[PDB]
Design a protein around this ligand. Structure first.
Ligand SMILES: O=C(O)CCC(=O)C(=O)O
Ligand SMILES: O=C(O)CCC(=O)C(=O)O
Ligand SMILES: [Cl-]
Ligand SMILES: [Mn+2]
Ligand SMILES: [Mn+2]
Lengths: 347, 348
C-alpha cells in the first residue's frame, strides 16, 4: 500500500522480479564495502551449557561477552526433535496459501498496525526503508497476557510446540543469567527480581530470496533491545553477520546449536562491561532463511540503569537511568529511524 | 586487598592455635544471643524404619516427624555399615592431608575464580560478608552430564567408586521417601517422579575444625536446605548440629551408622507448606573437628517449582509463588550468602 500496508516480502520474491522495489534499496553509505563481510578470526565463541557451573566454562563465557557480546551454545539440553518441530511450524505456516496466513496479519483490518502478528515492523514514514523479510511476532510470556488469537492454527500443534520450546529456553535464560551475575561480581540472583512476570517475545523470521542481495538487508543493522536473545536458525547456510570494531563478521549458526547474544538492556545494566552486539542478516538470491529468536526482557520493577553493585566512584555510571517505558519506546522508536537508542543514554 | 575473594582454608586457621577467630568469622551480637547453647530435644528423635515404610505404622511415624520436626533418623536404610564407613573414610583421609595435596582440588580456580564444585567454602560475594567456620568438598554427582571428574580427589584412591556406590543407595532412599510422603499427601505415589529424572544430586563433605571461640562463630550458618530432601551422614557426631522449631534451638546428635533425613525448601513449596523445611545450624567446639556428608537431592527443570495442583482447591489456596528451577536455585544460593531465607520471598 502507500505505507499503511507494506506488502509481504515473500510475495515479492515469488513474483520473480529481477530488481527489488525502491522502498527496499539502501543508500550508498549503507551499501559500501560492508556487505562483503569476513569470518571470525578465531573459533566462534562456544559455551557448553552442561559445564557452565565450572570456572573454566564461565571464563569462556566471559571472553565471549567481552570480545564479541554473543556466543554459540552447545549441550543446552533442548531436544533435537523439539528444535526441528518449532522450526517446522514456521516452515509450515510460512509455506502456506496466503489467504490462510493473512488471518494472522499484524495489520488488523489492513490499516491499523500492531507488534503482534504476521508481516513486517512499523512503517512510520513513507520514505522509510523496509527490510526484505517477513516476521511472526508472538508474546509468549507472561502467559497471562498471551494473545492466542494471533497464534497460528496450522500446523495444529503450533501452540503446544512453541510453548514447549518456551519452557526449554527458560532454563537457558536462568543458567546464563546466573553465570553472568557471578562474572559481574553481583549476587547470583540479582537479575531475577527484574525477570518475574517479564516479557518473553518470539520472533519468527522469514528472509525470502532476493534477486539483488546487494541492494537490500534481510534485517537492518541493529542491536537487540532485550536483556539477551536466544537464536535458532534452520540450516543457516549464512546471512547473519555481526559487527566488532567496525568490521562485519559472517557468523554461521551450526544446526542443532543455539546462538545467544546480548541486548541493549544488559549492556546498560552491567555498565558496558559486556556490550550488546550490532548485527544484521544478508539475503541470498537462491534460497530462503528461517530463524526463531526468543527475546527475554525486563519487567517494570526497576528503571534500566547501571547496577548499583557495579558502581563505586572509581567505576562511575557510563549510562543514564531511564524507565522501562522510556527504554522500550526508543528501541522500537529508533529501530524504524535506523539509529541505536543506547548511544543516547551513554554518559 | 581483593584477597578476600580467596577465602582461607579454615582447617589451616584452626591449626594456627591463636585465641580468637579472625573478625570476618565473628557473628553479630544478635546471632550470638541466648541461642548458641541449645536445648535438648523434649521428645526422642523421630525414627523411621525404612524397611517397613510401606506399612501404616512406620509411615505414620514419618508423618509425625515431618509435621513436628521436619527431620527424622532412618534405620534399615539399605546402606551397609562398611559402605557408610567407606564414604566417611573418604572425608577423613582427604581432609587429613597436607594442604598442598588438597589444594589441587580447590574450588578457587587459579587461586582466584570461584566455582561451587571442589574444596574450599561457599561464594564470597562481598568483603564484609561473615564467613562460616568450616570447609567443604562439594561434588556434583548427578546428573552425570554435569559431573566434572577432575575435581574428584585422587586420595583415597577409591573415591569415585565409593561415593558412586553410596550415592546410588541414597538415591534409592530418596525414591522411597518421596513415594511415602506422596501418599501422606493423598497424591499418587509417583506424583513427583517426573521431576526426579536427570535431577541434581550433590555431595557436600563438611569439615568443621575446632574453634578457640565457639561462642563467636557458626560452623555453618542457620539455614534450611534448598533440596527436595537431604540425607545426612555424620562421622561419630560428638555434637554440634542444632535445629530450630518455633524459634527454639535444639541439639541433634546423628547417631553413628544412622542417616538423618530432613525436608528441603523445594519439597516445602511443592507440598504447599503442609510439611515445612527446618532451619538448622552447626556450632563449633574448642576440642575436635567434626565431619559430615550431606547428599542434596533436587528436581530437574521439567516444571516450575510451585504447590502441587493436586493439593489445591477453593478452600486450599496456594501458599507459595511459582518460580523456575534456575531462579529457585540461584535464590537459594544467593540468599544463603546474605544470611536470608529464600523461601520467605516465595510465601504468599
Ligand atoms: O535471523 C537471524 O539470524 C537474526 C535474527 C535477529 O537479529 C532478530 O530476530 O532480531
Ligand atoms: O554437618 C551437619 O550436621 C549439617 C550439614 C548441613 O546442614 C549441610 O551440609 O547443609
Ligand atoms: Cl503439578
Ligand atoms: Mn536482533
Ligand atoms: Mn543443611
Amino acid at each position: 500500500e502507500s505505507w499503511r500496508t507494506p506488502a509481504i516480502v515473500q510475495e515479492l520474491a515469488a513474483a520473480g522480479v529481477e530488481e527489488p522495489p525502491s522502498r527496499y534499496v539502501l543508500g550508498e553509505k549503507d551499501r559500501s564495502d560492508e556487505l562483503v563481510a569476513a569470518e571470525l578470526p578465531e573459533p566462534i565463541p562456544v559455551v557448553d551449557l552442561s559445564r557452565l557451573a565450572g570456572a573454566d566454562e564461565a571464563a569462556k563465557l566471559r571472553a565471549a561477552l567481552q570480545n564479541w557480546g554473543f556466543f554459540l551454545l552447545t549441550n543446552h539440553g533442548v531436544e533435537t526433535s523439539l528444535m526441528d518441530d518449532v522450526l517446522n511450524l514456521a516452515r509450515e505456516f510460512f509455506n502456506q496459501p496466503i489467504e490462510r496466513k493473512r488471518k494472522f496479519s499484524n495489520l488488523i483490518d489492513g490499516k491499523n498496525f500492531q507488534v503482534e502478528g504476521y508481516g513486517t515492523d512499523r512503517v512510520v514514514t513513507q520514505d522509510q526503508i523496509l527490510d526484505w523479510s517477513d516476521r511472526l511476532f508472538l508474546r509468549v510470556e507472561p502467559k497471562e497476557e498471551r494473545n492466542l488469537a494471533f497464534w497460528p492454527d496450522h500446523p495444529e500443534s503450533f501452540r503446544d510446540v512453541l510453548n514447549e520450546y518456551a519452557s526449554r529456553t527458560k532454563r537457558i535464560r536462568d543458567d546464563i543469567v546466573q553465570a553472568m551475575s557471578k562474572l559481574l561480581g553481583l549476587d547470583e540472583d540479582y537479575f531475577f527480581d527484574r525477570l518475574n512476570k517479564a516479557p518473553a517475545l518470539a520472533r519468527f523470521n522469514y528472509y525470502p530470496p532476493c534477486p539483488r542481495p546487494d541492494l537490500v538487508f534481510g534485517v537492518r543493522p541493529h542491536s537487540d533491545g532485550s536483556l539477551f536473545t536466544i537464536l535458532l536458525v534452520d540450516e543457516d547456510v549464512g546471512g547473519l553477520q555481526i559487527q566488532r570494531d567496525g568490521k562485519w563478521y559472517n557468523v554461521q549458526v551450526t544446526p542443532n546449536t543455539l546462538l545467544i547474544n546480548l541486548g541493549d538492556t544488559m549492556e546498560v545494566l552491567c555498565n558496558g562491561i559486556f556490550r550488546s552486539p550490532v548485527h544484521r542478516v544478508v539475503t541470498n538470491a537462491e534460497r530462503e532463511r528461517i530463524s526463531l529468536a526468543m527475546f527475554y526482557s525486563v519487567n517494570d520493577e526497576k528503571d534500566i540503569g547501571p547496577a548499583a553493585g557495579l558502581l563505586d566512584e572509581n567505576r562511575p555510571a557510563r549510562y543514564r537511568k531511564v524507565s522501562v517505558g522510556e527504554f522500550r519506546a526508543g528501541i522500537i522508536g529508533k529501530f524504524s529511524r535506523r539509529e541505536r537508542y543506547i548511544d543516547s543514554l551513554k554518559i
